[PDB]
Amino acid sequence: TTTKKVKGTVVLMKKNVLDFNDFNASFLDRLHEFLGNKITLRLVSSDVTDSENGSKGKLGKAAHLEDWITTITSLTAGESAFKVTFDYETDFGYPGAFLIRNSHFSEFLLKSLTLEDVPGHGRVHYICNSWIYPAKHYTTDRVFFSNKTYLPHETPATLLKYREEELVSLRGTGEGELKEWDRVYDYAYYNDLGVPPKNPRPVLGGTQEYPYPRRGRTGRKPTKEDPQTESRLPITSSLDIYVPRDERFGHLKMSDFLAYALKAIAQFIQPALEAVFDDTPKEFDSFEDVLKIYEEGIDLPNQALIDSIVKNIPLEMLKEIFRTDGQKFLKFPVPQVIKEDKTAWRTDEEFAREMLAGLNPVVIQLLKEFPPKSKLDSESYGNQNSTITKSHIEHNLDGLTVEEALEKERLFILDHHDTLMPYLGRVNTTTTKTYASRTLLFLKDDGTLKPLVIELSLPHPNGDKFGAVSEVYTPGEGVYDSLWQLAKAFVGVNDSGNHQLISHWMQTHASIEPFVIATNRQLSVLHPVFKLLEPHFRDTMNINALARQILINGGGIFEITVFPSKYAMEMSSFIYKNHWTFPDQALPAELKKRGMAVEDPEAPHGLRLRIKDYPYAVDGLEVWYAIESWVRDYIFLFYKIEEDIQTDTELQAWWKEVREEGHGDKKSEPWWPKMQTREELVESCTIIIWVASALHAAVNFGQYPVAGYLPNRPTISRQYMPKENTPEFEELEKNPDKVFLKTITAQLQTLLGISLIEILSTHSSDEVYLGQRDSKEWAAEKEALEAFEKFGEKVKEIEKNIDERNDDETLKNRTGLVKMPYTLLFPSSEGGVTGRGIPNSVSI
Template sequence: MFQVPGVSGILNPGGHGHNKIKGTVVLMRKNVLDFNSVSDLTKGNVGGVIGTGLGVVGSTVDTLTAFLGRSVSLQLISATQSDENGKGKVGKDTFIEGIITSLPTLGAGESAFYVRFEWDGSMGIPAAFHIKNYMQVEFYLKSLTLEDVPNQGTIRFVCNSWIYNANIYKKSVRTFFANHSYVPSETPAALVHYREEELKNLRGDGTGERVEHDRIYDYDVYNDLGNPDLNEDFARPILGGSATHPYPRRGRTGRYPTRKDSKCEKPGEIYVPRDENFGHLKSSDFLANGIKSISQFVLPAFESVFDLNLTPTEFDSFQDVRDLCEGGIKLPTNVISTISPLPVVKELFRTDGEQVLKFPTPHVIQVSKSAWMTDEEFGREMIAGVNPNVIRGLQEFPPKSNLDPATYGDQNSKITADVLDLDGSTVDEALANKRLFVLDYHDIFMPYIRRINQTYAKTYATRTILFLKEDGTLKPVAIELSLPHPGGDHSGAISQVILPAKEGVESTIWLLAKAYVVVNDSCYHQLMSHWLNTHAVMEPYVIATHRQLSALHPIYKLLTPHYRDTMNINALARQTLINADGIIEKSFLPSKYSVEMSSAVYKNWVFTDQALPADLIKRGVAVEDPSAPHGLRLLIEDYPYAVDGLEIWALIKSWVQEYVSLYYAKEDDVKSDPELQHWWKEVVEKGHGDLKDKPWWPKLQTPEELVEVCTIIIWTGSALHAAVNFGQYPYAGFVLNRPTSSRRLLPEQGTPEYEEMVKSHQKAYLRTITSKFQTLIDLSVIEMLSRHASDEIYLGQRDNPYWTSDSKALEAFQKFGNKLKEIEEKLGRKNTDEKLRNRVGPVQLPYTLLHPTSDEGLTFRGIPNSISI
């Protein structure tokens, strides 16, 4: 006899007698998830369950039920009784009978239906089902619940999948499994075939162009960012597949090549597996379509305004910048008429009858309008801002370069010890006491500076030295600005050292020097800390998991919530954000070299260093200390990102350890799991194939290694992304605080620009940093990227409480959620401790980016499960 895990009782497989098993099917109509139907949803319209514009579905429940009546068939599959081929027996077809109008658990836009299956004792225990859709339009299947199964009680199937017409697939039926978890060796024999068949369907054969209804996961290089058919300026190097430009892989689309380069795909609508499309209500659909709207409609409208000189092209004062949120910009009527019908404009730009474009007030100036200019805030944002994981401890002075001197000459720092104000300490003493830190972008930017400075942009490669004061704050003590030697790269760098100043023209020069640093930091943040180290590196995990881990696999159930929407938002980025002449190239310093620069950084990416403790140690901002919390002693004790991050990291790891131990009790269990081994082999050799020969990859031979791997993946998709994403508008929504570009170098004495700098530090600053047009682009996009959606799912939550039938796993997950609540309260108390000056800083903005929960909107807090925007 056989007992299905997670449900009580045993069904005697030898028993007979006909039974009717009652079930409930929950689905969502297609148009609920269409961007244009958002207003329909708010009115509670339940008509048109399957698509709009077809004229076959009425607005009433009766019409809906009649239409669906014999259009969707279901068949239960036994987990305990097999046919002559060893496959679980399949029951008779059954069809949806009627709609349930009063189910309390239904979400917005969902509809529930009765279904009854013929099933007798000789068929054993049902644990899977087939479904066929005979309609011409798809629907979104949420779940099937079987009730009063003899001796079993309730059996649940969590589906969350699009169901298309059966005839468009080679295999006409879709198969779903009950919410049980099985490692491959423990899978009921009757389900083995279905488990393997479903994985085979998801892998595809690696050929052909993918179309909307496909469910295939496969790999490709980033060969679709440029469009050489337009002209040479739109050509971009292929990222991935070479030592020159290594890169993580993205989802394969199989589109036709461009005419001028057969290795490049034509840009356009990008395929992602159908179930990776936004399948919920927020929806990210709104945000995604908002970004598309900005790219396709809003930016051209802005361009016309500036081209026709209908608004001043420059900010003339800092107040002009503040007016973007305090008073707005008045736009011509014809521009407003073009963009105001767009929902994204109404929601995000808040236009009104006065034709005013107005943005929300960024958090960084909500209390003080000028505190962003202080040196203390400049240093604090390196450990509590939107890019808090780059600063490192200085190990030697002066800082040295790792660039090849045969190619780049002498690139070592020209900062000397005698110019540094270290509050009475010598450089040697400060190094010995681990009180010197550096924000070093020299080696990253220098190979590109000559090319960048041949565009509209003008900038430097920067190094910033900071001193840890007795009060725990960081004091910038020198900034080095470097340019390539006019005699050629091999001749080294031309550098100038700028020192802090509070008066006269020197204070303006210091302010500009800090701006050049922040421009470097902003670009590194967006392209490396944000895009590369979260979005791009996660996509191979998503692909490999669906190709190699069955939905029955416990690790599949552990990881997939942390993949929600990631492939879709990445595809959107390739269309409108990181593509040639896209939003990033229009408004960020490296322009056409932006993503190429991230490839150069990926050469030195190390999977194991993505673990927060390893990252802190590698950057020299922490040392191992068994007596300290989490086994680490922070060298900057009041380091909000690290302090809060270690709490979240430790809790994620504890949850993963407890979960993994339920399924891998013995040392050899991980090694002997074929799905798990194929999964990890594919992550390394295909998903991150350009780095596959690196020795640091975990071998995935033990439960401990599995815990490490899963913790890193979950941390990356949840907390790390939250830390570098949801502070974008709060900090960078005020462009003076975080400019994304610089347009001229430091003025030289005797020039008109120098005289302007002497007369007005504000005009000198504004003519140097991001232009007005670029600012509008930046604000329009990062406001959306910084928002939480209404149906976001946060760390410690699941979209379905029945995601597994394993009671021990559910108990462990509940404990994880409860501890997250405790940590959130603990982190909140830290922000009220006046001794911890870096928690709020001069701008009076408490660090809350790693608080687990959030409301909808611009909240500066909240850790979603996944990279969903």
């Protein structure tokens, strides 16, 4: 065996680089430190076996990093590359894997390895994106595999054991408290949410009464009072809640710590706002007092208190939150809904449109009974069918009789009654006062909807058991017009509450997480199905741990700013239990579910829209089919016959734990796909990429554009509708615009909410969007890298059809009377709150 040398390249990001402090060229040096005996790497062999090691497969001799090399890249993103030379034998074979030991003081992030001129194989790339902690914190050396993509029965025999050990290692032991360096993926209920001494909450998951998807296990110690509940970190705690060390990264520039701006908001702005507005409340006497937050900001009673707030928050971030300029400390940008017409939102035309091209455009339904009936249990909830009468809308319909209209597929309903009512008696005791709403719309011949009637139901006053007492409002001349504007604000509260909790949180943030856990636990990094979904999981877990820490915990920011309050989280379980199923998250079936589309063969996809112009749908369906078309190309590169799926040890494992643990509170539902055949894999993977990419997008990055102006999309309502011959009714005639700002959200919670959905709408510099990947070599099968180039170019095409339909004045619903083109499904985007773009993942 004449040893022959092979030249290597290891890339790695130093820890300083990704820490909060701003990255400068300064951060590279002291590079020699990684150099020396300190960092060890050994190859492992696919072809030949080291008898001695195990039947694992042979280990080459150890290398070390020799000298650094500097690249145009080294400067940008601060990867620092090193040199390394491998004494490589001719009888070694392909180096499927490599082994690393870190003997340095601090952890570094190892992006990559490249071997050049390996004999007989040319170039081999290894993509590992792992924090490497000093060898002290591990019981055995980290191992990374080559980019080659393998099924469980095409994996080399000498790497099977390396493949199976990392898996066992990943799942962990299911016990103990997980640590900083622990890459352990596991399941736990949502019980870290509440503090029993102050603001306790029920556990979510494990019970028929509160089923809920699972979250990554932390294993913190249980409380002294309740052994159901985990102990929470203090708000005044610098450190943050566990996620696997490879689900958390830095960013180069502190601005891109959207994660910590929120920590900043909870920690610093909120306590201050509580102080300021505590000594003296103020109320928005009028709408231009509102428009004072986007013109001169709002003054704080003294610069002394902000010594604190500016002081603890990095400026670049502050700017992301707030505007420094002008004479006012609290200033925000002009939202898009309010950029070109300040008063186009009090119109029924925008109110109806937003249902289709809005922030929360997934709720509208097609109505097929009149007066509408409710699906609630007759015997426990009373008579809940609508109090609307044929008369109320009958005139409004352009001469059709209602039954003609229903027959004509032209009456549409936005139903918030059923979800809300059971909790309304409880919700209403809290700071909020509200109603459950049905809003009926009529589709005029030109493709727009007009609202007809709003019914506002309150639970029966003798208790839930006996019914609901409802009061219907409709468009009218005079003060009665003033009521109609309030009825539109109480549907806003119902809606934006359904948006945050169900649309954004339950559907995307909380329901995704069970998959990222199951994928890493049961699918090797080598797996083809792993490489397809792992871009759509990035950073999901890190930000969800945060929500638990500051957003959805008892006393959390969501509870403060959303109408359910204390009962807010608890409801999303009730909604999950009753209405969430996996196959319905598929865009076409969810459409067919609300009856917004049907199967028609001479239709572009076998799907026809009931409203031809529905932006969320017409852009989304292009996207949905684009992804399906790419999951399809890719699943049939590795699964050639259908029994390759039946016999994938891991896939079958991956899908069994998805159902009996991750969503195990719906474990016994019949609608779960079996996974025996390839199509079920093509159609279930495409669901997961859809929910993580465009579904989260179409509802996350519109928040500041449309709801950034509080009046357009109220969060909370403080009062019931004024009863007649009441002083307040007198007031409505005199200052109906105040009764608006009295009924809806108070200042304190508006400056929370704006600033909260501002950070949430921001796009990072970091962010990667749909059709892109972190590096262009993520697999060594070239037919997989053209299937994905063809996906990216079919995503560029969708970006052009979108931009031809906003310039197209034929479709009214798209621009609307605010002149705000529907860009919530424009794939590509650039940094900041840009009101467009589809990240790969649920990153915020």
